[PDB]
Amino acid sequence: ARGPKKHLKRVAAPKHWMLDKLTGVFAPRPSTGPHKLRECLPLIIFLRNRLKYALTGDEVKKICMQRFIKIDGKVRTDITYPAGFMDVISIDKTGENFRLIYDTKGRFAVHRITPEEAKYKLCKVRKIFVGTKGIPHLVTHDARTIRYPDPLIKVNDTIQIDLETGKITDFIKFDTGNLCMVTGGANLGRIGVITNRERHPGSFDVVHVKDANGNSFATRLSNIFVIGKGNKPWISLPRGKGIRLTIAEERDKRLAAKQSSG
Amino acid sequence: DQRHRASQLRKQKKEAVLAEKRQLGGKDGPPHQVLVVPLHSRISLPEAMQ
Amino acid sequence: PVARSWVCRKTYVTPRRPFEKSRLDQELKLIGEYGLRNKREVWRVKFTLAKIRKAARELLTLDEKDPRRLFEGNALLRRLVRIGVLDEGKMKLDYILGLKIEDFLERRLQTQVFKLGLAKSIHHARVLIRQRHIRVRKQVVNIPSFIVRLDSQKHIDFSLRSPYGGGRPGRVKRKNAKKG
RNA sequence: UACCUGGUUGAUCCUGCCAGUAGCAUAUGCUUGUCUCAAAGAUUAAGCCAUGCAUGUCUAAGUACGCACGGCCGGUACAGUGAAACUGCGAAUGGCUCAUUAAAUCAGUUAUGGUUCCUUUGGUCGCUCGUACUUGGAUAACUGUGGUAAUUCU
RNA sequence: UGGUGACUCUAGAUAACCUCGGGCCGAUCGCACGCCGGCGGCGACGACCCAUUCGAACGUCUGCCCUAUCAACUUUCGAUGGUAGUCGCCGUGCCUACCAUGGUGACCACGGGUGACGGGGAAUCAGGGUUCGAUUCCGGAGAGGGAGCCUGAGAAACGGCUACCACAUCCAAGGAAGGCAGCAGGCGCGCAAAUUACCCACUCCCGACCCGGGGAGGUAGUGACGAAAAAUAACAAUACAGGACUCUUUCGAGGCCCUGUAAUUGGAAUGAGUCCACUUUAAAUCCUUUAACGAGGAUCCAUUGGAGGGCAAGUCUGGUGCCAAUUCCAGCUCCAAUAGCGUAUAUUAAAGUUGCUGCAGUUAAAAAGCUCGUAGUUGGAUCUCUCUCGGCCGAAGCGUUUACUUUGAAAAAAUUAGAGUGUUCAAAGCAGGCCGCCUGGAUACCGCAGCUAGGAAUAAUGGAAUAGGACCGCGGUUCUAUUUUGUUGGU
RNA sequence: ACUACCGAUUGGAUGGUUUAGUGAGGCCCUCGGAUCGGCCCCGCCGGGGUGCCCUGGCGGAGCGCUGAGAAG
Secondary structure, three states, X not given: OOOOOOOEEHHHOOHHHOOOOOOOOEEOOOOOOOOXXXXXEEHHHHHHHHOXXXXXXXXXXXXXXXXXXXXXXXXXXXXXXXXXXXXXXXXXXOOEEEXXXXXXXXXXXXXXXXXXXXXXXXXXXXXXXXXXXXXXXEEEOOOOEEEOOOOOXXXXXXXXXXXXXXXXXXXXXXXXXXXXXXXXXXXXXXXXXXXXXXXXXXXXXXXXXEOOOOOEEEEEHHHXXXXXXXXXXXXXXXXXXXXXXXXXXXHHHHHHHHHHOO | OHHHHHHHHXXXXXXXXXXXXXXXXXXXXXXXXXXXXXXXXXXXXXXXXX | OOOOOOOOOOOOOOOOOOOOHHHHHHHHXXXXXXXXXXXXXXXXXXXXXXXXXXHHHHHHOOOOOOHHXXXXXXXXXXXXXXXXOOOOOOXXXXXXXXXXXXXXXXXXXXXXXXXXXXXXXXXHXXXXXXXXXXXXXXXXXXXXXXXXXXXXXXXXXXXXXXXXXXXXXXXXXHHHHOOO
């Protein structure tokens, strides 16, 4: 190519979007923004393919242009704006709030939350650096820069931040015995407790996590998001609590639900 | 060398074809003579020749 | 680039040796028994049986408590029971290797229309289905090779719109009845 | 379904290749009632092209003295709609083909602690000790006179 | 100050510099207006810098077909390296100056060829393989051939520009304009491939933008490439023919059944068609739904091939010549698959006729006069975890190093395998199910190479034999402590 | 009569490596300076602090100072 690519083919779209083969040749192609392309939910796919408020992209644009949609407290009018992990979507006309957090199968849940829970969000800090006149700055996972963070906050910690003021409210360190959600790889969406961190210098660290049932799984350190302190999460969790059931247990619970309801 | 040889032969064939197609119906040649034959009695030949 | 899918499958196999007497006679036996249009329906059902046998064999090469064996064997056995080819008391993979083409031929809609006494013959059954007189549940089914499930066996009846069913007289009868 | 039938000898067994057979591609012949999907100028010529179309774009929010329309109220600079033109942005995506290209391309893996980056999103934007209640000259559209056989020329 | 595994990192301090072809520090536009001339709320646009996003570009390791009838190549003219610079967005022989004489190669360099773009993938399939991948996804490359620029964040851009080469258009002869390997369409080439149609309604893209535009894309048209489903008849009586069962030793009788075959009768059922209306759709068409008509030789008439040498299938007929045998031609009868069926060519399977699995070499294709004789390939038996500092543990040296095996992380979708789901069935699709609610959109596989932490059998390799070998303590010589000589000069 | 090889003519034409020479076009550098504008001088001249100065429009020359700048 001679410059940036502007289109996304549907079969080259992210699989967790759950687009079907025969609707079109193209996929919605997220704009540049606070989240990566492969790790986002564009606003049109959320508001059409998940919530079914609209049936075509034209009336997705009609819902957006009336300024009824907020991501993290700001009116977002772009229909392919990349919303990602821990984003709070507010639709105050219907009086609904959502948080974009993963399923146990690695897809963005439709997770309805309380208006009180819509006030804040958890951001994983991604770098700390000192800028001119010795000012500490903190860069999070969704491209926020906060000036003057707490001196105890190091990289990979989780900050609870207030969406109206943009100021840090609390933080959690990266420790063992401490609660995380997986944000990448084969274990994406699972929620457990950090038990280990085997450091590899010049390479990627690996973090070991234990599930609430006793299942153990490892990830890369870049795939860890601390979501609670110790054992209790700091946010509402979806229906599946980060426990990945096997296919046999999925079949058993499905048949039990059919037999009980029906 | 194969590419050049194929180009030479293609140039020969195309110039021969161009001369032969240029002969008929052009300024240096006889008119293109066309016979119109209507194969049914329902066909209005003066409409077609108009 | 088009918004089309090109995924499609041949559903039968032509035999390797074209002219052998035993296979020809057995195919003609099945065609005559079941009222099949040509040899290709025999080859189609033979193909689905061969696929199921290959799946059961590849599951049987696994060790006994292999979770893929349990999941995929349970699914295969449940489907074969659900169309009534295996009995409910035979949920063992080895019994899949004992099946025959005649079972899946018995589960056709042509055969089940014949055996339920809606038709006087097997060819009358194929004709009866093909002409929109037979309805499974409340759906007019036109396809002779529609495989009937066990929960759909007790619901095969006559179309509420058919002359033999609900009762509007047909084209020939309405033509003849208005002559006088 | 880890499958066969035949061909050299007067006759037997063998070697050995072949013929039949089955699948996949292209082409072609004969035939063709219904219905669902569906490939389709690659192979030869990355040969040559008549004609038409394929890339444009305005919000309350850069510039409106085109009556091209259109109400006030009348000293109120400008109601409003608004072609043209200036300005801004896009035209580096998409689409096509497979000529080139043999550690090249490409895949997997790694690195930028060796670089640039429109835009989006966040931060920064009285941090400088030194006519402003607003600065200057133009140029289009428009009016008018023209040149050339001919152009999206001027 | 803060960081990394490692900075010549980030931040700090001082001396200054700061390009006129000049770096920020707002002479911009809208909407609501309100407080005590001064104070103001939402936005829009610009903007140096840092981050982020979308990338891009250079590198790392491993991996590619055929050829020796290509065995030495690169090196003057940069080939391999060093120092200093230039240039570049940056690392770098990228380029320049001076030095060094290097760098690659039978483990196949260099050269040539390929009917070679590379992958995801396709066919076959016991397994190993063999063959295919121009082609809708990802990466590359090009816009007749070369070459050079302009603008811009991004192009060596061709639906931009400037030349030359090859073509070619208009002309009043002075001049002007060009580039379908975009969509149609045409000529040519050939065995070989569709309409100069309709639309931005869908999918998405771009723009100042809810509004405009899109031969991208969608929709019809041509389409026996190919894949799915699927008509071309069914039944009753009658008449013959078989086969059972009751009664008879049997012949025979069965208003006893059952099954076939009809120049035999009979009305029942229906599509194919023709044609209103809806529905469909951007507008249509098709399908689906429904009025009306629509079947006896139901003439509303199924074809394509092969058979009298073997796989299925003949003891046949009539013309025509040659000397009853016998060249050419037209038929009958039978068999096979069937809305499909022959043929050519290529290719794969049978095929163990390329052989690793897994072939051969007395007499059939083939093992050399004999010995010596590099490389390469192969090779007898043997050998059963700790030391420090911080909270029984964490850090550190690992133990000779490997080859091997295992684990973990990580590794596009589509395709394939496979779970669920009555698309009317199916090929498919990703949907759907219940009286607003309840759900799905699983899962596996993914050579090798590389990271990860275990295993120590098998196979290499090394560890003391002129002992200048371990483990201890006694040392002597030389260099060396960042501190326990308040502040210090310290021999 | 046909099928198929060799072949003088440097036959003519074209291509790929190269020796020697020329070399269009763009880009960079050193010039060049057709034109356009301002400042200074003067003239027609308006007011004030009361002829010192400046206020604004036009004209006049000066290789004076220059700034921008095409062809080449």
